């Protein structure tokens, strides 16, 4: 009773149907393609790049194929601050699979400034501490000599260098930290030049602090010497994140947790493993997994219109043709002949023609499948509050494509279903026509689809009719003799 929709009718019953929409997912965040994910948990991307106290299990993360993240990472960026170009950094991470947290500027360099970083709001069980990768330059000996850090790229790949500046809340607090005002932080590379000027002003009390941290990130491309210069307020990086490899990763905003699996795709709801070509699970997939369509079901009527018959049997030992509808008793194939000879009645399929029809259906669906090859890494980008237009654009763009493909999927099977159903009907007519054209004048065309012979036909001649070698002149004389009277 598998019902399919077609262009012409709706809820048509078909003998066979192959749903080509993978609606189901296991529901567990699983390791992808052998390479485990990056189980962040409660720490935001900023928290991991800086190394909050709340998560020190990440100091050397093995290679990850995708990243997860809670929607609101409560334990990221402990010190109340901002992060300039956060979303550009996240989109960069989407295409990075492995870091190595190389030393660039160890605490040994800053022998003229006290490296002791303190923070009440970011306390470690009551003790004042700071992000591991950042060093919080303060005055030494009631003086702040001009900090002059430098680095020359050596590791042979783009290095993510992440630094920051401090906006103190009080002039007194500014001076007690840096012993001078009118402070500037200059960071220069071969292409980047940025001179931030920290400003002390009254800001709302967040986590008890008024001052903030502005954070910036940059890339040392290739032997690009970076120069940090400051007369205070600089939060130096002691840890440059060299990117080990390129790749295709993503950020999944999921609250689940990693388990043990092996799936070539992974979606925020759960993993997907199927051979089907579509899935309405969730658009934000990762890796080798099929197209997304907003539909609820795509049933391909590979079978043929399942019309039962009236079943008035046992009287004359013979059956009615295909005009009245299909035969419940045929199991050998889609199309066939019922031969009511004098040696015994019986059905018999037409193996060749039904195999041809099945090959046609299979090649049809396969060709559709091959033609569909679109974007693979359709991960979800992030946009700041002042980029709303852009975000909308993205959404609309992405949404439009889904809609188009939904159409291009739904209508397709719709047309294809009609394409198949009458095709089946066509075949039967051809079969009938073929037989009718091979039995020119030796058959009473019984008008329900049958052929009641004029000459006594043993099982051999009717077998010959089935396989297309019937010899008309052999029986022509006897058939004509029977027909005349």
């Amino acid at each position, epitope marked *: 009773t*598998e019902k399919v929709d077609t262009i012409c009718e709706r809820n048509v019953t078909v003998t*066979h149907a*192959k749903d080509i929409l993978e609606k*189901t997912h*296991n529901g567990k965040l699983c390791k992808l393609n052998g390479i485990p994910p990056l189980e962040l948990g409660d720490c935001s991307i900023a928290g991991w790049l800086l190394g909050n106290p709340k998560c020190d299990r990440l100091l050397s993360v093995p290679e990850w194929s995708y990243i997860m993240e809670k929607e609101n990472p409560r334990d990221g960026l402990c010190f109340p601050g901002s992060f300039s170009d956060y979303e550009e950094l996240k989109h960069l991470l989407s295409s990075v699979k492995h870091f190595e947290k190389v030393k660039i500027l160890p605490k040994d360099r800053w022998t003229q400034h006290t490296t002791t970083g303190g923070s009440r709001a970011c306390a470690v069980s009551g003790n004042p501490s700071f992000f591991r990768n950042m060093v919080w330059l303060t005055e030494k000996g009631s003086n702040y000599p001009v900090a002059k850090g430098s680095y020359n790229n050596t590791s042979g790949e783009q290095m993510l260098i992440i630094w920051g500046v401090h906006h103190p809340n009080d002039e007194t607090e500014q001076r007690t930290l840096y012993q001078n005002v009118g402070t500037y932080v200059s960071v220069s590379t071969s292409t980047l030049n940025k001179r931030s000027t920290p400003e002390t002003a009254t800001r709302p009390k967040v986590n008890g602090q008024g001052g903030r941290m502005e954070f910036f990130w940059t890339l040392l491309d290739m032997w690009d010497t970076i120069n940090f210069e400051s007369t205070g307020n600089l939060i130096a990086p002691e840890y440059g994140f060299k990117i080990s490899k390129r790749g295709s990763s993503g950020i999944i905003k999921t609250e689940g947790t990693l388990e043990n699996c092996e799936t070539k795709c992974q979606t925020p709801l759960g993993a997907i*493993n*199927t*051979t*089907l*070509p579509f899935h309405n699970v969730h658009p934000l997939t990762i890796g080798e997994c099929p197209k997304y369509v907003k539909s609820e079901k795509l049933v391909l009527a*590979t*079978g043929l219109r399942n019309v039962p018959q009236i079943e008035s049997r046992g009287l004359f030992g013979a059956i009615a043709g295909f005009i009245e509808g299909g035969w419940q008793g045929m*199991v*050998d*194939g*889609w199309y066939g002949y019922h031969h009511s000879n004098d040696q015994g009645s*019986g059905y*018999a*399929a037409d*193996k*060749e023609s*039904t*195999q041809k029809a*099945f090959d046609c*259906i*299979t090649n049809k*669906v*396969n060709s559709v*499948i091959e033609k569909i090859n679109t974007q693979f890494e359709a991960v979800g980008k992030e946009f700041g509050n002042l980029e709303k237009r852009l975000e909308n654009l993205n959404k609309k763009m992405e949404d439009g494509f889904i809609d188009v493909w939904t159409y291009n999927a739904e209508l397709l099977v719709l047309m294809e279903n009609e394409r198949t159903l009458d095709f089946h009907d066509s075949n039967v007519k051809n079969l009938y026509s073929k037989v009718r054209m091979q039995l020119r004048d030796n058959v009473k065309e019984l008008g329900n689809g049958c052929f009641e012979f004029y000459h006594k036909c043993d099982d051999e001649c009717m*077998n010959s009719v089935k*396989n297309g070698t019937y010899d008309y002149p052999k029986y022509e004389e006897e058939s004509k003799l029977n027909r005349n009277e």
Partner: antibody, heavy 122, light 108 residues
Framework: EVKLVESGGGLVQPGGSLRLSCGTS????????MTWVRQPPGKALEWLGF??????????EYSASVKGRFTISRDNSQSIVYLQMNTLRVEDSATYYC?????????????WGQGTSVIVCS | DIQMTQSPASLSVSVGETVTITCRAS??????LAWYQQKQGKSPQLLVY???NLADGVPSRFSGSGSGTQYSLKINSLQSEDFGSYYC?????????FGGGTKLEIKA
């Protein structure tokens, strides 16, 4: 172009148990007449049993020799079919093939995996 | 359960003409049959289904015939690659038992 993979076999003590599995790659229009067959190293190829799809119940048709010994069933959620070896004997030693007719109807056991050998030496 | 055997059992012959391998039957398997080539060291292939129809890869050197409880395959032009086990299998009776199989090689 569906590749039937399979795994599970190896060296087993007589009377043990084993988890044979064959799984399917590629897009199959139907996996209805899933079938397990075996060939002893003596080259007397012998058919074992069935398993079918949703449409007509996950029914089975075992060989008379293996009516109750092996048990075929599928865990459809990941498109794989398991065969359980119980009450093993010396005769069970054979390379086991996963096989499957392409059509909705049985016309040819025309998709065969690489086979996994199982060896019960006395 | 039905009786199905290769009457011309495993043999050895040169190349280049017809070789006939025949399959019996105890009861009326109408024409549903399959002919499998099995190269030693490789998974069995498919040659003829329904006892007369050729597989997807048509060798143009195999053919089938028969009906009722009597079937046969003929290789009109044997060649070196055609050496291997050959099987007939019926799909009518619920036990899909196989044939005895025939080996094909050359007389040294």
């Amino acid at each position: 172009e569906v590749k039937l993979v399979e795994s599970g076999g190896g060296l087993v003590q007589p009377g043990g148990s084993l988890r044979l599995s064959c799984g399917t790659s590629g897009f199959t229009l139907t996996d209805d007449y899933m079938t397990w067959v075996r060939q002893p190293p003596g080259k007397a190829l012998e058919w074992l049993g069935f398993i079918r799809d949703r449409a007509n119940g996950y029914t089975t048709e075992y060989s008379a020799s293996v009516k109750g010994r092996f048990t075929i069933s599928r865990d459809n959620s990941q498109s794989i079919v398991y065969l359980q070896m119980n009450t093993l004997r010396v005769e069970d030693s054979a390379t086991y093939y996963c096989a499957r007719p392409k059509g909705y109807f049985p016309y040819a056991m025309d998709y065969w995996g690489q086979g996994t050998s199982v060896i019960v030496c006395s | 359960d039905i009786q199905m055997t290769q009457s011309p059992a495993s043999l050895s012959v040169s190349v280049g003409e017809t070789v006939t391998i025949t399959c019996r039957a105890s009861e009326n398997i109408y024409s549903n049959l399959a002919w499998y080539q099995q190269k030693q060291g490789k998974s069995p292939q498919l040659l003829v289904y329904a006892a007369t129809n050729l597989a997807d890869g048509v060798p143009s050197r195999f053919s089938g015939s028969g009906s009722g409880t009597q079937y046969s395959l003929k290789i009109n032009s044997l060649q070196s690659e055609d050496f291997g086990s050959y099987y007939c299998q019926h799909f009518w009776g619920t036990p899909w038992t196989f044939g005895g199989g025939t080996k094909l090689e050359i007389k040294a």
